[PDB]
Amino acid sequence: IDVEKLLELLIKAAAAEFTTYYYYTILRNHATGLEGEAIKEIIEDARLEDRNHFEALVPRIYELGGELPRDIREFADLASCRDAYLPEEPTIENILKVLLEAERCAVGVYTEICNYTFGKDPRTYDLALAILHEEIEHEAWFEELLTGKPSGHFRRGKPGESPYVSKFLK
Amino acid sequence: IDVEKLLELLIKAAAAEFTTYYYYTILRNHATGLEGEAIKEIIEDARLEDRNHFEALVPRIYELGGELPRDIREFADLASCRDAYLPEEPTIENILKVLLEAERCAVGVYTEICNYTFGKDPRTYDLALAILHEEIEHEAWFEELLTGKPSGHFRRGKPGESPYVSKFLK
Amino acid sequence: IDVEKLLELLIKAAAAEFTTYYYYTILRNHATGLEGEAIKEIIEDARLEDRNHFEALVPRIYELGGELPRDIREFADLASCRDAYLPEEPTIENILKVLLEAERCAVGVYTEICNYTFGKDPRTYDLALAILHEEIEHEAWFEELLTGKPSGHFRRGKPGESPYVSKFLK
Amino acid sequence: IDVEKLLELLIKAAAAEFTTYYYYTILRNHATGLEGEAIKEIIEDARLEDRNHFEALVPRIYELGGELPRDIREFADLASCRDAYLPEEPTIENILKVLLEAERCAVGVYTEICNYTFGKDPRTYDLALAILHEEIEHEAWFEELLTGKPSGHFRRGKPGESPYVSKFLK
Amino acid sequence: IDVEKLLELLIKAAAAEFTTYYYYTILRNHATGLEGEAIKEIIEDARLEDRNHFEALVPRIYELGGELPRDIREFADLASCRDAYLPEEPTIENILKVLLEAERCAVGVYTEICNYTFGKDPRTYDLALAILHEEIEHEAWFEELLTGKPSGHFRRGKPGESPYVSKFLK
Amino acid sequence: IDVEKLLELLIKAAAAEFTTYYYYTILRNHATGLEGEAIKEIIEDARLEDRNHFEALVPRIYELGGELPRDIREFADLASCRDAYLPEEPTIENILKVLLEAERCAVGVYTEICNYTFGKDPRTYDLALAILHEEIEHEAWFEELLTGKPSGHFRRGKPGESPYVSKFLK
Amino acid sequence: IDVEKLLELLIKAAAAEFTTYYYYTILRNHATGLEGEAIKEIIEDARLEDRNHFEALVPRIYELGGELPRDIREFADLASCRDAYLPEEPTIENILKVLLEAERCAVGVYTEICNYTFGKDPRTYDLALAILHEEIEHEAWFEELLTGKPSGHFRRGKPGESPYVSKFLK
Amino acid sequence: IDVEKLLELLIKAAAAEFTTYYYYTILRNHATGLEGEAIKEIIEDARLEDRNHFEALVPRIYELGGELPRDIREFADLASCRDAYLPEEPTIENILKVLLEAERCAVGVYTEICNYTFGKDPRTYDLALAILHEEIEHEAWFEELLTGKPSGHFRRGKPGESPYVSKFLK
Amino acid sequence: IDVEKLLELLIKAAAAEFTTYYYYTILRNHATGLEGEAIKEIIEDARLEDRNHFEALVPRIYELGGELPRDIREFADLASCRDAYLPEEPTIENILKVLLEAERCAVGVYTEICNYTFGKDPRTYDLALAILHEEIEHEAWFEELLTGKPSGHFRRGKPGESPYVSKFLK
Amino acid sequence: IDVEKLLELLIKAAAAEFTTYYYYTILRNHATGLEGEAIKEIIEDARLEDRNHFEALVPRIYELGGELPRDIREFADLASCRDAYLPEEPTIENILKVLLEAERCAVGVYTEICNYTFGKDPRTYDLALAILHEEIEHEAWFEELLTGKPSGHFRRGKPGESPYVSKFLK
Amino acid sequence: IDVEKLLELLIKAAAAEFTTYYYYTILRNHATGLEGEAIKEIIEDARLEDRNHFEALVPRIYELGGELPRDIREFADLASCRDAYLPEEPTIENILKVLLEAERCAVGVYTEICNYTFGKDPRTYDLALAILHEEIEHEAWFEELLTGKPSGHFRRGKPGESPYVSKFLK
Amino acid sequence: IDVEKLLELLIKAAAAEFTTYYYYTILRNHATGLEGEAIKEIIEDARLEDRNHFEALVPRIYELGGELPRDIREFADLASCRDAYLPEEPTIENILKVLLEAERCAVGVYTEICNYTFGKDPRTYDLALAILHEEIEHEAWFEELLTGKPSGHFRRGKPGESPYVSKFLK
Numbered sequence A, B, C, D, E, F, G, H, I, J, K, L: 001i002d003v004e005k006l007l008e009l010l011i012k013a014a015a016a017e018f019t020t021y022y023y024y025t026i027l028r029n030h031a032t033g034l035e036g037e038a039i040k041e042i043i044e045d046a047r048l049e050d051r052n053h054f055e056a057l058v059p060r061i062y063e064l065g066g067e068l069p070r071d072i073r074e075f076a077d078l079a080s081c082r083d084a085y086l087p088e089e090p091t092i093e094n095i096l097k098v099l100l101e102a103e104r105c106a107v108g109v110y111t112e113i114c115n116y117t118f119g120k121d122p123r124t125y126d127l128a129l130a131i132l133h134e135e136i137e138h139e140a141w142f143e144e145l146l147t148g149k150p151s152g153h154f155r156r157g158k159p160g161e162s163p164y165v166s167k168f169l170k
């Protein structure tokens, strides 16, 4: 396994989690009205779990001999998912589209890391898998809200509980 | 009081609670979209309390010298309420109709047991009354969601808390 | 500072909180249907925090040498906000209008008390400010639900937690 | 059973609980001095449990198709117990007399509802019985404090815990 | 209803609960060996719940204008169940026989009180019913251990939790 | 050390604790009125800790090869303190006199056991000392209430917490 | 990976967990007598964890685009383990044989799913592995009770805690 | 603002809090008898909150570049309130007089600091205000106990909870 | 008061808190070795409280009709404190210098907001003051670690507890 | 007192506790079958408390200027009790014999230390006494299981709680 | 035993604990810099436990018929340990020297009380022993920090937990 | 997979964990002085987690049909890591070297087991991975303390929490 390549993947993933923490704050605040009130708590759970994902990734990056970039702007520019901007027409549907696209990119990111580390870096694989669990659940949430396809999920107990990633958190 | 007749009522009630636990799982998963997100937690609270009702009824059945049927299929066929099938057109309204009809049947079932045991089997009466409390609240929930008639209820704290039946639970 | 004038303001504020506790009970029970299910918990949090506000104001009234009026009807007639009656056409929108108008009046009431006591009665100012915090949040809640303007708030953890007024509560 | 008559009883009971919540606030604040310090916590427990009784009665009123009156003054005028006014000579003994008379009226109110619903409305009977438990304990408290007749009770753990009515509370 | 007769029943019941608390201490300590280790915790749960039953009955006795007898020996002599003496051959089977006989007598005692107070003394009926719940469960426990007839029960969580009588306890 | 003599002391002590549990129940219920309300919780803490003392002594009696007497009447007759009867004139002062005399006898009982076991039976000494701690505090409580001599104590947090004996309790 | 084949495996596994929840209820209730008292809590822990396994599998089935069958009878007929019927001679040994056979089938079921998803469906693999952990422990429990071969396990803290599957539960 | 003058005020206030912690220990221990039992817990809550006030003031003194005096005697001599000596005739009334006078001095001390720092030292102002809240409540307590004027307060939950100063405590 | 100017101050403050959350992550990870082990937990508490400060500021920004900038890079560029870069020679002393300079800038930022809103925007003033409390404590921490001047502080209980800002957090 | 001799006793005791932690692991795992299921939790409580005893002894050894031996084999060879080997015929009875013999040796060890330190080394005496409490209870447990002599004990709440030694544990 | 002599010892000990509470506050605040950050929490634990020691000693002084001196200065002058002044050169080493000397004096004080009360005043002996436990641990802490001799201790969980004295605390 | 070879690996790993529990006790006690105070808690967390690792490995060894060796000396001799002896010159640096070498050996041990069981023994692989997580974190801790290379970790909340292995613990 190429630790330099792995470190780039992990840093790009951490950048996506960090920027998502900011952009989902904006999206949550624009999920207004009666229909917005349904999804506001769901966005908040996704936002806080993505913050947890950033917190879980940074120790592994440093364990592997990597480091966060010096400038926060450099870091944001490394994000492996495009920025989850507030849509120009911020309807609930358009916001859900942004959220679903972001979660689908995240699922792809950690699937790629899991594929890269499978049977080679057990600790990193297990960390990527833990985050992948939560991203798959996020993607299921938003896909159901947007398309009506049954996801099998309903409200998390308290936002940001991160049941799969918690063992990596301090 | 005819313990054999009482046992049949209790077993039929337990069968209805058990099957409801399965069928409400399906119904919860098809309460999708923005409007489904409102009622998903309400279905879940009803589903988990009906599981509690099954757990509360079984000890009383055995205390009275009865027993569950040998085969799970026999048991399901004994249910005193018709199966809460997913409707062919699973809109939120059609799902609510199934839920309301099921809860109304449950209210009838425990009202019948309470009438049968009033002043004759205090422990069984109190158990039937405890479940009846929760069924009346479930029926109120779904009737309000479906017809807009004020029920007087809003979200339970945590799903499955069963405030009335808890003293019967282990 | 004129303690007699201050006492009248505080008693009128306490009357508004007390009557709101009653009228919001009615409003919560008529927020029915799928769209009502969104706002029912929000009304309940506002109702329980306004009950807390009454509980926090009464000790200060007595500390300052005032007292509640002898008759509950006299007390209700002193309310500094007009009664939050159920609207003749109790749609969710019309209910939200009543709630928003009540919260806006409350914000005005405690802003007036804060202005009257600023730099003169520190304990009363701090109490009025604590309640003002919660009224501003209530007003933000309902204004977002009604107009879609981003308020920055989403569901309180448990209704009636009163994070700002709790230090005044027993 | 005549649901209209039952609803009137329940609303009148709820009015008595609501007004008691106000009037006991006044009574608690005038139970002063060394001897008042004994009974202040007892009044407070009674006051908070009567608030719980109001909270428990309202859902049942709405379940049965009733509603609270539009105006808080109408509601107060419906109270089935006369107003627990602060006595003109507010000695501890005179305050205890008011409290005992109020609790005795409450015991009568819920005894009447229990008699009306016995074997006919199990849920309402059980609710009336739950409140009756707490009223009988309140009456015992104050009768002992006033006459020295042994009641068998001593301080509740925390005021407002409502051990009998809690299962009806949210 | 004849309060004097009711008081005698309640005092005799309280005496049985009090003496059982002592005699079950002896029985628990003689349930030795590998087979005794099974039932020791079951005896302990029964013993502590019977202590709770004594604690729950005394306030009601005093509420009704009765009192405990002056001398503890008088009290013990009033017990409505014969003393649960350690058997002359204290085998596990012989101990279980004593326990089952005691619980069957207790079930009879509270069934008699429930019959006497049904529809006449709601608070006392509810107290007798609460204790009856726990006695029926105790009788089921020991009957299963002794005869193998399925009771439907297994270990209580913590001994002395008294799920049915707790609302009467301080 | 003479284990037979030690066992007699321990059984007589356990009998005193057991009977006190009964007699203090009566005394607590007759500590009525405004002045009784002060000491009711203090009696209750003493009563529940003396119940704990009985629970702590019985295992040690059995560890040492002793056993409780077969009949509860035999047991009560062994009490090392005379019965704490309700006084013929049950004033608060006369009740306090009974309580103080009982606690003084208890202090003497465990002082005697500590003297007998000092440097010879460490486990029994430590158990007697643990109970002695609580008896000395009880005696201080009642002596202050009766004579005004400063004891240095004020209300225990929750009655029956037994801070010194808890390590011996299950 | 063939999602249709995977879905069939998962649904058949969920059916086995669901039916086990019923059949283990019967088995627990027939584990009577002194020797049954040992294993009753062990059956109960297995039963509640198998209920948790059903709850954990259903969301994954829906995430993958599958659904539970319409009728509860269809569902039961899909179970990948034969029904754990009460044996015709329900001795403790014969009951243990049924339990061990059921757990061995479960171990086989999740081993097959893990083999099918290894390195291909990380989330499903991790879910199957989590359940496999608990099935291997169940099989160890019952094999030790039946054959005396050391399993390395002793009583779970509280039944149904599911330490391995909890992260999948809501 | 003159930090040297402010530091002197804060150190003198801290000295008063520290010495009060000692002197209220004496006063609590001499609040004996039946009437003393009422106020003992109130003195204890005041004593522990004044200890908290000392703990809250010291960090601010050091933050501002001040320090506690080298010798504890120097420190005690700086107290801004005269020593709360046990009165020569330590009746409950005379003790209450000492307590009320001490609390009135404390209210004056923190009112002076609040006036000195208003709009100039926000952190110190907020700290002085937090302590002032608790001193005003203490003064209300003792004034009611002594004169019967309604204060609006009753027993704090647990002594020393310091609801207003807690945010400054570690 | 000029809400546009106030909004710019608040957004610039929120940007500083957000970027600090990133940069302190880097600084914490480079506080290595035996001497670094002392300050690592202190950096972590500062980092998590600054994250809390961002979370507390955003709702107020939206309440006042402002919004976060569309792009995370725009946001970072608005920070009112220069970026807390890892020093080119990352010794513990040089890291402490960066931390102290950042905290001093933060103290200045919230002092400016408090000055701008004093007596004009009570809610915003109280929020700025709450954050100012924590920044003053952070500055004290690092100044003591760097210069040895007594600050009066020692380790926070758990990192990120934010005792002053918590009432603003969800 | 001869600290060198005392240190040897304490180190030999710590060695016995440490080795017991290992050997009881083996014994617990071989207490199989239906009869083994009774005693498995009892062995586990003894094993975890003996681990606690090792943890409590080591600080005292170092306080007195002693140290653990360099090599773990040297340490094991110092054990004051012979190794609790799995018996060649590992029946439940033979295992109980090993356990009882080990506990009897432990009781002797701490009795010797208590005798050596009585009135000379209070801290060490109190530590030895604390462990002696738990060893006497362990010996009682196993003696009852093996011989049927009443011990007075039944299941500890949670294994390893060490109620007597806890004050020495970190 | 001479209670007057014992009272003088106890009061002198309480004075030392009280003054230490003040002087250790100063010492903690001057344990600055990177090396001071290690010992600051250790000083704080010692300081809070010595406050607990004062709280534990005062009730015993009053139980024995003693009393605290009228003036706080008299009290401080009675301290059995010389004042733990901040050293003229307040280096970490010089501060540790003061702390170690103070703890050594405390160990001597309670060793003297234990010697005086051994086998004569069990309650006082046990109290002195409880404090002696904590003083020996404090002395071990500081001696290790100062000289490097292994003490066997590391950080207490939370400062002021007083595991040995807690049973004497309210 | 060769279960005999796997069992040898697991037993050798368990031996290393067991001996580490002893040797880290010695190392922790010799990490003295101001610089030792930093790492003492880190050693303690590693020591308690390695004890947890032993507890987690033993059930798996028995599940697979293996057993611990008869004699504790045989067991210690099987350790897969050389004994972590206290260095002849026990400086903090030399102690850290021993700790780092031990953790590096542990990382190698569980990496080997993971490699051996990957895709063949899922339960054992997951157990080895869980321990590997904690060993990698331990190695990171000590490497940072020794070399200054950023590890990304700071103090665990409470020592011995084992966030990754907890699901395997009872």
Ligand SMILES: [Fe+3]
Residues within 6 Å of the ligand: A017, A049, A050, A051, A053, A106, A131, A135
């Ligand atoms: Fe994420």
Ligand SMILES: [Fe+3]
Residues within 6 Å of the ligand: C017, C049, C050, C051, C053, C106, C131, C135
């Ligand atoms: Fe309000």
Ligand SMILES: [Fe+3]
Residues within 6 Å of the ligand: D017, D049, D050, D051, D053, D106, D131, D135
């Ligand atoms: Fe009421």
Ligand SMILES: [Fe+3]
Residues within 6 Å of the ligand: F017, F049, F050, F051, F053, F106, F131, F135
């Ligand atoms: Fe006692």
Ligand SMILES: [Fe+3]
Residues within 6 Å of the ligand: G017, G049, G050, G051, G053, G106, G131, G135
């Ligand atoms: Fe399963």
Ligand SMILES: [Fe+3]
Residues within 6 Å of the ligand: H017, H049, H050, H051, H053, H106, H131, H135
């Ligand atoms: Fe103060």
Ligand SMILES: [Fe+3]
Residues within 6 Å of the ligand: I017, I049, I050, I051, I053, I106, I131, I135
């Ligand atoms: Fe900040």
Ligand SMILES: [Fe+3]
Residues within 6 Å of the ligand: K017, K049, K050, K051, K053, K106, K131, K135
């Ligand atoms: Fe001390």
